[PDB]
Amino acid sequence: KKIITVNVNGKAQEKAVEPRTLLIHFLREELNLTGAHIGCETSHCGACTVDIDGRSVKSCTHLAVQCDGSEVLTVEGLANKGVLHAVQEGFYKEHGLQCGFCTPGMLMRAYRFLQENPNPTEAEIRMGMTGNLCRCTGYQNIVKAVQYAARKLQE
Amino acid sequence: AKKIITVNVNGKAQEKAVEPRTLLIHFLREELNLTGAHIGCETSHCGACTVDIDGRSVKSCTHLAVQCDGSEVLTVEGLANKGVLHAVQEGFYKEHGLQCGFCTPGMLMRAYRFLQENPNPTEAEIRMGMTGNLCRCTGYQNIVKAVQYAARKLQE
Amino acid sequence: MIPPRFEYHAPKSVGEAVALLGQLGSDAKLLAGGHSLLPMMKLRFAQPEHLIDINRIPELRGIREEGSTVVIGAMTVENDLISSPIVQARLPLLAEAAKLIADPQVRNRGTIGGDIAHGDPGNDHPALSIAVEAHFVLEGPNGRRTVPADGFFLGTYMTLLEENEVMVEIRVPAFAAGTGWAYEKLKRKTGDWATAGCAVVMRKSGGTVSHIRIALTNVAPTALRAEAAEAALLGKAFTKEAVQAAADAAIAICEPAEDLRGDADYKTAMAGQMVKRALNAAWARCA
Amino acid sequence: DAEARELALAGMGASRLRKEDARFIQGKGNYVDDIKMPGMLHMDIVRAPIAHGRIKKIHKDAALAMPGVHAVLTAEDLKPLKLHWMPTLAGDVAAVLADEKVHFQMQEVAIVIADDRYIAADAVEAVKVEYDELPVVIDPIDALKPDAPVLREDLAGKTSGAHGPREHHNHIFTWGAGDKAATDAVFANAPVTVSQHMYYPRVHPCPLETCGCVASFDPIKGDLTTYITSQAPHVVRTVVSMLSGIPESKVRIVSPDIGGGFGNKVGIYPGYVCAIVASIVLGRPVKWVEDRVENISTTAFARDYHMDGELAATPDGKILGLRVNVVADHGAFDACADPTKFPAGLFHICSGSYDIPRAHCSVKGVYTNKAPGGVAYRCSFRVTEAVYLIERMVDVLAQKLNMDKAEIRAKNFIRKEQFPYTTQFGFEYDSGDYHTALKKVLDAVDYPALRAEQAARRADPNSPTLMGIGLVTFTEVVGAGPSKMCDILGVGMFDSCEIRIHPTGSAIARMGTITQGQGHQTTYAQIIATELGIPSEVIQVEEGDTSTAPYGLGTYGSRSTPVAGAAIALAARKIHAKARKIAAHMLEVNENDLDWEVDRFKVKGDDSKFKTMADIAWQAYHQPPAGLEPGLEAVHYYDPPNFTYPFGIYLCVVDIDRATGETKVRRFYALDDCGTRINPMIIEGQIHGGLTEGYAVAMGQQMPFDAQGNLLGNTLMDYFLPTAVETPHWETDHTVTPSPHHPIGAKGVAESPHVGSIPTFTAAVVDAFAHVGVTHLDMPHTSYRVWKSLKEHNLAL
Amino acid sequence: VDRFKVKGDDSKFKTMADIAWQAYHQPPAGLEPGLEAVHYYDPPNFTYPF
Amino acid sequence: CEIRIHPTGSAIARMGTITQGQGHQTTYAQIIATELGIPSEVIQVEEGDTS
Ligand SMILES: Cc1cc2nc3c(=O)[nH]c(=O)nc-3n(C[C@H](O)[C@H](O)[C@H](O)COP(=O)(O)OP(=O)(O)OC[C@H]3O[C@@H](n4cnc5c(N)ncnc54)[C@H](O)[C@@H]3O)c2cc1C
Ligand SMILES: Nc1ccn([C@@H]2O[C@H](COP(=O)(O)OP(=O)(O)O)[C@@H](O)C2O)c(=O)n1
Ligand code: FES
Ligand code: FES
Numbered sequence A: 001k002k003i004i005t006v007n008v009n010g011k012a013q014e015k016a017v018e019p020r021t022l023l024i025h026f027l028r029e030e031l032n033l034t035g036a037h038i039g040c041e042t043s044h045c046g047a048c049t050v051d052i053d054g055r056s057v058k059s060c061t062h063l064a065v066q067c068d069g070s071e072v073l074t075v076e077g078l079a080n081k082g083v084l085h086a087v088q089e090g091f092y093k094e095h096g097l098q099c100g101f102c103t104p105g106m107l108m109r110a111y112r113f114l115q116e117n118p119n120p121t122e123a124e125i126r127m128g129m130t131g132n133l134c135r136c137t138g139y140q141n142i143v144k145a146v147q148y149a150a151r152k153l154q155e
Numbered sequence B: 001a002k003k004i005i006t007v008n009v010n011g012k013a014q015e016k017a018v019e020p021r022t023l024l025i026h027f028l029r030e031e032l033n034l035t036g037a038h039i040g041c042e043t044s045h046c047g048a049c050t051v052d053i054d055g056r057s058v059k060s061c062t063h064l065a066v067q068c069d070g071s072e073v074l075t076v077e078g079l080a081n082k083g084v085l086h087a088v089q090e091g092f093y094k095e096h097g098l099q100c101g102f103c104t105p106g107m108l109m110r111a112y113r114f115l116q117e118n119p120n121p122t123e124a125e126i127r128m129g130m131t132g133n134l135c136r137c138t139g140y141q142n143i144v145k146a147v148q149y150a151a152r153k154l155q156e
Numbered sequence C: 001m002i003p004p005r006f007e008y009h010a011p012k013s014v015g016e017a018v019a020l021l022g023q024l025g026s027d028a029k030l031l032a033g034g035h036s037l038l039p040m041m042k043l044r045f046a047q048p049e050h051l052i053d054i055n056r057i058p059e060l061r062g063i064r065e066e067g068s069t070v071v072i073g074a075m076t077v078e079n080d081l082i083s084s085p086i087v088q089a090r091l092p093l094l095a096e097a098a099k100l101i102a103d104p105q106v107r108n109r110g111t112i113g114g115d116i117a118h119g120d121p122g123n124d125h126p127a128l129s130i131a132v133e134a135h136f137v138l139e140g141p142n143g144r145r146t147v148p149a150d151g152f153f154l155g156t157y158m159t160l161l162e163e164n165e166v167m168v169e170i171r172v173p174a175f176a177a178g179t180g181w182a183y184e185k186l187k188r189k190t191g192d193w194a195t196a197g198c199a200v201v202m203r204k205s206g207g208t209v210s211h212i213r214i215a216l217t218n219v220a221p222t223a224l225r226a227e228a229a230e231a232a233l234l235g236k237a238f239t240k241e242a243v244q245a246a247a248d249a250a251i252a253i254c255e256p257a258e259d260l261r262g263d264a265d266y267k268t269a270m271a272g273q274m275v276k277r278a279l280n281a282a283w284a285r286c287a
Numbered sequence D: 001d002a003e004a005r006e007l008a009l010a011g012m013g014a015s016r017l018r019k020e021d022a023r024f025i026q027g028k029g030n031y032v033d034d035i036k037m038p039g040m041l042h043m044d045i046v047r048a049p050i051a052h053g054r055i056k057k058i059h060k061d062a063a064l065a066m067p068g069v070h071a072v073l074t075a076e077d078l079k080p081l082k083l084h085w086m087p088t089l090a091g092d093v094a095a096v097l098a099d100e101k102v103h104f105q106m107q108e109v110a111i112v113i114a115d116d117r118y119i120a121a122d123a124v125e126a127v128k129v130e131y132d133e134l135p136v137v138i139d140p141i142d143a144l145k146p147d148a149p150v151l152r153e154d155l156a157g158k159t160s161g162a163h164g165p166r167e168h169h170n171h172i173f174t175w176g177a178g179d180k181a182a183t184d185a186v187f188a189n190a191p192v193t194v195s196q197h198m199y200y201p202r203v204h205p206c207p208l209e210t211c212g213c214v215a216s217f218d219p220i221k222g223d224l225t226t227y228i229t230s231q232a233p234h235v236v237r238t239v240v241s242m243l244s245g246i247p248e249s250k251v252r253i254v255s256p257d258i259g260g261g262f263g264n265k266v267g268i269y270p271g272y273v274c275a276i277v278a279s280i281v282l283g284r285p286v287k288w289v290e291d292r293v294e295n296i297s298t299t300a301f302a303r304d305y306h307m308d309g310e311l312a313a314t315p316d317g318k319i320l321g322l323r324v325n326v327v328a329d330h331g332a333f334d335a336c337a338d339p340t341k342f343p344a345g346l347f348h349i350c351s352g353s354y355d356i357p358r359a360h361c362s363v364k365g366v367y368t369n370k371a372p373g374g375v376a377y378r379c380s381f382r383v384t385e386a387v388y389l390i391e392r393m394v395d396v397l398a399q400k401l402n403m404d405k406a407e408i409r410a411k412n413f414i415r416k417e418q419f420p421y422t423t424q425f426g427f428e429y430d431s432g433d434y435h436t437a438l439k440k441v442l443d444a445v446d447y448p449a450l451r452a453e454q455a456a457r458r459a460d461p462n463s464p465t466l467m468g469i470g471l472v473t474f475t476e477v478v479g480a481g482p483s484k485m486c487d488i489l490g491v492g493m494f495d496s497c498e499i500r501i502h503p504t505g506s507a508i509a510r511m512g513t514i515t516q517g518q519g520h521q522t523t524y525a526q527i528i529a530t531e532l533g534i535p536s537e538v539i540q541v542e543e544g545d546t547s548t549a550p551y552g553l554g555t556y557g558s559r560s561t562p563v564a565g566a567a568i569a570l571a572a573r574k575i576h577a578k579a580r581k582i583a584a585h586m587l588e589v590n591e592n593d594l595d596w597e598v599d600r601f602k603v604k605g606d607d608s609k610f611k612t613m614a615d616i617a618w619q620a621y622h623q624p625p626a627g628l629e630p631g632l633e634a635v636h637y638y639d640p641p642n643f644t645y646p647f648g649i650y651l652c653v654v655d656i657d658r659a660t661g662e663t664k665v666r667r668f669y670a671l672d673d674c675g676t677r678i679n680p681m682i683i684e685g686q687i688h689g690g691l692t693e694g695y696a697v698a699m700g701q702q703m704p705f706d707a708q709g710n711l712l713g714n715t716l717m718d719y720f721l722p723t724a725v726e727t728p729h730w731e732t733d734h735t736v737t738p739s740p741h742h743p744i745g746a747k748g749v750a751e752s753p754h755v756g757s758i759p760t761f762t763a764a765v766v767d768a769f770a771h772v773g774v775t776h777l778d779m780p781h782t783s784y785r786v787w788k789s790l791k792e793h794n795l796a797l
Numbered sequence E: 001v002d003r004f005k006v007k008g009d010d011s012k013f014k015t016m017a018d019i020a021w022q023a024y025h026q027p028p029a030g031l032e033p034g035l036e037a038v039h040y041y042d043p044p045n046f047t048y049p050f
Numbered sequence F: 001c002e003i004r005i006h007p008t009g010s011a012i013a014r015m016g017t018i019t020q021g022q023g024h025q026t027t028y029a030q031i032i033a034t035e036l037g038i039p040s041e042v043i044q045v046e047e048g049d050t051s
């Protein structure tokens, strides 16, 4: 076991972790940040997507031990003092979620994608969200949610 | 500064670090979630917090956790064995020795030890041997019947 | 989902990493982006007892220019390849083709070096590295050696890389002014490995092909250079007939594996089609 | 102002935002794997590496000695409790843990209980099992051959099952509906005839959240609590009680937030039983959560129908008869979700949207070395197959007559005035207006212009692409209910709703259903809002907890709006009737002298004199008018008089790359009519999702098995799931033809997009090859398969 | 005690268990499925123990 | 009081009262047992939760 210190949602977390522990299990089992989900074992779905050191990463294909000294953000940390983040508001307003299983990952991806590309086209949105699968929405509303968030971020 | 200690509760080692002022009752309830033992006063009268420490009945609200490093603590959650109720638990159930059940855990732990100190107690001895435990619901009558029941079961 | 137990190591230098590889032997594996290695470990395909993480070694990072050679750190992440102003100006093919690799999240971890070192016929960089005539710098206990992309791939999951070596950087000559290029990739969906793919780099002189490099993805146990196909074009006028001949020559060297992406019949025919589309798109980009 | 008050309610018809979004967008949803209980252990399953064979020996010692491992159970540990086999909704029995042999690859052989999922996984690898491989049965046809191996050795000697007599050891049943004699007669004298064979490939619902549960038996209290991914918690409770011996009132099943169902989470899987047994044995909580590969490989699959459709007609295109024969592959055990009396579901709905005078169908169930299932993917109990068949056949008949595919449909449609229409199979379609909807769709896409573009492209033999136009006009049948004909394990297919108004005007409502993301917490509240004049925002709805919610049959087959929607309205209306009675007492007038206006009872004539629902609620708790009991609440169990028949008209235009076999959906127009609409926004989401499932199934999904019975492509590596890039932009439209018998005229709609889209895609792909004589092409229409057909009909390159 | 029997014929009876199942299985015409009730009691007078 | 009889015969009962040790979970069950012919052991009574 290696002792690490990861900054999760703005707070330092000094923990002892087994090297094989996937970041997704560390987030869900150790910190109880159960927003992030698991939809596959092949790294396709992206329901485990979290923001690590400025980038969108699928936490099921990253080790917690690798986050020693890293800056990690989850969906629980998106809202600011209770006020929803643009992306959270966008998915709500544009009905971008149903069962809500892929939502945390979608929000974390959109949160980063919008900083990568502030004024994306529909094609750019769809392509920029390719690492996230959804079984309920058909993606169409998710596109509108991202567009909605983009308009408010430049407001 | 918190002190690292290991307390044996119900045969299981409990490794914790607590401030010296931590009363045993809060250690059992707050640190171990063994919420059977209860708090009914701040003057050491009720006995709702009674647990068995190193072979003696003790009011955990008037004892420090830090004084139990290596001790053998018995709580109500540990009376039953393999699911089978201890004679004392069976006694309180069969004789209706409890209503709200707040003094019960303490009564049981006390009865458990009293019955070893005195296997064949008379009524007077039971009432006297159970004086450290207060009860607001029962009136004590069914409790002495419960202890008499447990006494008999232990001898057969 | 659950990978087996292993010991973890995180060296800060290539030398320490190389030392660890020697000390621990074959039971150790270099961990890079982890997007091929971890998935395999999570399915119990590979069970190394030691993982040597190389993400904390700064000398394996960075993109620079040394003369007419673009030096790319083995640990360069796919997205950094896409956003790199150097790669966009000097090697436009790599910047655009990297977009066809996996998805955004995977591209934030998967590195060009790991994509190459993995040696999967399904990966894109192997063919790409051949079309651009790249070279790989490998460091071991004895020092450094440089091997060509063309000759690096030996078999499925097998390359010239030795068990005590670490690929340090990918060196590729900058595109000469007016170089045409292309990478046609037939895939079932975005983020999936190619059913068939073709990388092309070419130069023009009048109505003829003055320079030509053709490589094939996922149509054999390894990525392939198609020299016979190249020969159907070099010094000849760029015509429909010549392009068709190149495809046939490329088709002739295919040895596709049959799986859910299709049979040998389909993959081979798709390789030819991608060659035809690649050459045409490359010619269009020439000047 | 009265209009303003109605708007303020956010009830029927409003596109209000969802009440359930708050928690989900902040990661505060409560799914099964999010649950952690004191002393909770984790369970993992040892699965069969082969498709068929006897179990020689199971080695438990290496796993048992492994630190962290508490138990390793096998079928032997289940026999005393008679739980090594469990009953199914199809009247058959499925193995909980393989006993003498394994019937399909990935089948549950043993379980392990450890401190966590990591150690648990190591324990499964430590458990070694020896097998004696036996010949495998993959093709339904080979299964019926005289020398076919005996799969179900447990059924040896039996000549009858739960669905009639059995003609072979691998034969599960044979079911039929319609007039065979009359239909055979029609076909014999019909001037025009067509027959086509088509395979509806086995696919998987693959919900993003897999199946799982946290079973917890408390030896002290003597009761069981199981948090589970179940689409029917109440019946699960009844079944669990029966098999465990634990009285039903001491069994509590709770479906929390579920990450999608789509019919995949309707049944009881062996993992649940084992978790329960393990929890009961160890005396503490046990968690089981399957991985993606386990979900695709062992939970309920869909389709897998081999169909032989026939259509009799006259030269002008009027359909005279319909004859269909089917071979159904149900896997090793028949656990196909269905009402007890329908082993092939409502397949006899295959008469479609057409007035066909005579028809007959016959479905033959067959056992194979595969995982059980059959009904589980927005299919409404085999309606997906029925619609695909009829629509495919109509196209075949259209092409033979050289008649336009829309024209032949308009000519055969059941006319608006014919409803309620009784079909050849016995169904009484509630209502419809197909003609108006069809013209609406054709006009919006400029259908004639489309055919001209297609004709112009076909004329050029060099056109790099092929243009295809698919059109489907379908009728659904949802709201599985009439207890006389529909029942799950003996329980009538009704549903319920309990609504309770509080002293201050707000309310709490519970139903026997269970949403999985379809929005019941919003929509259900909207129904009650309009019925009682209480804003939907403060009508708190809950489902899934068998210990608090009224008994129901859960949600699948789009039965919620039809069945629960009716119970909600009726329970609300019971409250409204009492409220009127109370309002009369307060206003010192007679009930008949009152008028309900949005949220208040006002005296006829004098508007100033009125009493709001808030006023009435308070009075109910203050002092009840003589004759009435205090309080304001109601309960209602609705046994539906008939199903609901929503319809649709979908059109799709595709362009096929002749050089690669790639198919690009250029356009898709979907028109659905589900009667009265509760929330247009929520309806639009269901359509988008279902059409997407349709695209996935028709263009990519499949579950192939090799000669040895190994499942291929059982992970996201190959199992097709479209991303935002592959998913096309959907265009939606609608009409409103209310269900006359329904309390609010609303019909189900969630499964319509799935059912209808699949044949629309095939219609478009086949239509692209139609000019060279192609009548049908089996799904999936992957580029590999379309290219294969492109080369066969000389259209490649 | 726990069953409804036919007057003059003990052999013909139905226990509460039989009735309960019947309630969920097939409700008699004019009856909703299920078997439950609620009651809000407003007492007519107090009780006077001694 | 609200009583719900389950398909198998057992039942769940909830009242608007709240015991503090006087034995409601037992006595209430006894009243219902005699009225319906269902043993008191399987008539689970509960109180105190406004929801
Ligand atoms: C869902 C998904 C889709 C993908 N799609 C594609 C695709 O379409 N096209 C494609 O090309 N790839 C694809 N990939 C793979 C990513 O492209 C592979 O991520 C990366 O192949 C293996 O690179 P890595 O940096 O992750 O390294 P790792 O996973 O660590 O693997 C590195 C392998 O090479 C060795 N290695 C790594 N770095 C070095 C080094 N510096 N020196 C020596 N040896 C080294 C390791 O020991 C190991 O054997 C996909 C991956 C996923 C999960
Ligand atoms: N006429 C209709 C039918 C459904 N719906 C809504 O769509 C969602 C799915 O409804 P449904 O009855 O078809 O399916 P399930 O909810 O049974 O999956 C439920 O929230 C709805 O209330 C609607 O608003 N109007
Ligand atoms: S769990 Fe599917 S990509 Fe991480
Ligand atoms: S909302 Fe259910 S998978 Fe996305």
Ligand code: FES
Residues within 6 Å of the ligand: B038, B039, B040, B041, B042, B043, B044, B045, B046, B047, B048, B049, B050, B059, B060, B061, B062
């Ligand atoms: S709490 Fe009263 S004696 Fe301990």
Ligand code: FES
Residues within 6 Å of the ligand: B097, B098, B099, B100, B101, B102, B103, B104, B134, B135, B136, B137, B138, F021
């Ligand atoms: S039973 Fe209530 S104080 Fe003893």
